[PDB]
Scaffold this active site. Structure first.
Site, short mmCIF file in Angstrom:
data_model
loop_
_atom_site.label_atom_id
_atom_site.label_comp_id
_atom_site.label_asym_id
_atom_site.label_seq_id
_atom_site.Cartn_x
_atom_site.Cartn_y
_atom_site.Cartn_z
N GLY A 45 0.84 -1.17 0.00
CA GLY A 45 0.00 0.00 0.00
C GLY A 45 0.88 1.23 0.00
O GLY A 45 2.03 1.18 0.46
N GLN A 50 2.96 10.05 1.36
CA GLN A 50 4.25 9.42 1.66
C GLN A 50 5.32 9.78 0.65
O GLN A 50 6.52 9.67 0.92
CB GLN A 50 4.11 7.91 1.70
N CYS A 90 5.26 -0.20 7.26
CA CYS A 90 5.09 1.05 6.53
C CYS A 90 6.44 1.41 5.93
O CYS A 90 7.46 1.34 6.61
CB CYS A 90 4.66 2.15 7.51
N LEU A 91 6.46 1.81 4.66
CA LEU A 91 7.71 2.18 4.00
C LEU A 91 8.32 3.46 4.55
O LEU A 91 9.49 3.74 4.31
CB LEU A 91 7.49 2.33 2.50
N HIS A 132 -5.15 1.94 7.35
CA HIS A 132 -3.79 2.41 7.49
C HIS A 132 -3.48 3.47 6.41
O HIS A 132 -2.83 4.47 6.67
CB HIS A 132 -2.87 1.18 7.36
N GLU A 133 -3.93 3.23 5.19
CA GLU A 133 -3.64 4.15 4.10
C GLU A 133 -4.49 5.41 4.20
O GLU A 133 -3.98 6.51 4.02
CB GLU A 133 -3.87 3.49 2.73
N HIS A 136 -2.89 7.96 6.51
CA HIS A 136 -1.80 8.76 5.96
C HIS A 136 -2.28 10.09 5.44
O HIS A 136 -1.58 11.10 5.57
CB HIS A 136 -1.11 8.03 4.82
FE LIG Z 1 2.07 3.35 5.73
#
Ligand SMILES: [Fe+3]
Length: 168
Positions: A45, A50, A90-91, A132-133, A136
């Site tokens: 995702g 991000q 998470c990246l 989660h997305e 962000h």
């Molecule tokens: Fe994330």
């Protein structure tokens, strides 16, 4: 193109995204770059914020053969129920994982890559991934759910990693 993914403690990760006015070729370029970035880093995702693009765009692909591309533009949560948690990653928070409380089942409305509306009911890992997305986009990270001590420890770990990451 592969875009640079921001890491904590970058302040740009806390910005609230604006909704996409109109799904045009510029937006579709962003969507395609996002998928390319996500696969490159091997995530499942990615939110637009991000990669320091502050519009309400999310890409997801949980598939093994990288061929179940899911695009959420201007997502809205219509319903949620239940409660779960898995250890999320998470990246933007390299190599850290933590269990975070989520709704178990979720129903959303969004636009696809063509700007056409759709509804989606999700449970399991998909439901968790969408929450989660969506977080962000309002400047929330999964560590925000944890204790102050846990949060501090995660920040340090990532700062230590990015410090070695560049070996000059
Ligand atoms: Fe994330």
């Amino acid at each position: 193109s592969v875009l640079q993914v921001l890491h904590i403690p970058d302040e740009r990760l806390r910005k609230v995204a604006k909704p996409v006015e109109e799904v045009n070729a510029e937006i579709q370029r962003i969507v395609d770059d996002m998928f390319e970035t996500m696969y490159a880093e091997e995530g499942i995702g990615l939110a637009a914020t991000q990669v320091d693009i502050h519009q309400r765009i999310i890409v997801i692909d949980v598939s093994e053969n990288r061929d179940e591309r899911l695009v959420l533009i201007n997502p809205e949560l219509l319903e949620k129920s239940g409660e779960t948690g898995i250890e999320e990653g998470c990246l933007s928070i390299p190599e850290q994982r933590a269990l975070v409380p989520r709704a178990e089942k979720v129903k959303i409305r969004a636009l696809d890559r063509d700007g056409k509306p759709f509804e989606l009911e999700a449970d399991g890992l998909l439901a968790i991934c969408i929450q989660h997305e969506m977080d962000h986009l309002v400047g929330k990270l999964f560590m925000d759910y944890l204790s102050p001590l846990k949060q501090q420890r995660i920040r340090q770990k990532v700062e230590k990693l990015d410090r070695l990451k560049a070996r000059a």
